[PDB]
């Protein structure tokens, strides 16, 4: 299972929560792998490249 991100680093951890472009594309991308923090994900809206 890899997830959206031009490149991702496919890290597999319990307790790394994930992100999703509720831009468009409706994709899950990692918050390491697309470069978001752990901050942005709980108080912001995820618009990713394709979406942006
Ligand atoms: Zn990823
Ligand atoms: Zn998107």
Redesign the pocket.
């Known amino acids: 299972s890899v997830?959206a991100?031009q490149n991702?680093?496919?890290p597999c951890k319990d307790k790394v929560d994930w992100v999703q472009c509720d831009g468009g594309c409706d994709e899950w991308?990692?918050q390491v792998?697309?470069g978001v923090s752990p901050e942005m994900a709980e108080n912001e809206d995820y618009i990713c490249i394709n979406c942006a």
């Open positions: 997830c991100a991702c680093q496919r991308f990692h792998c697309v």
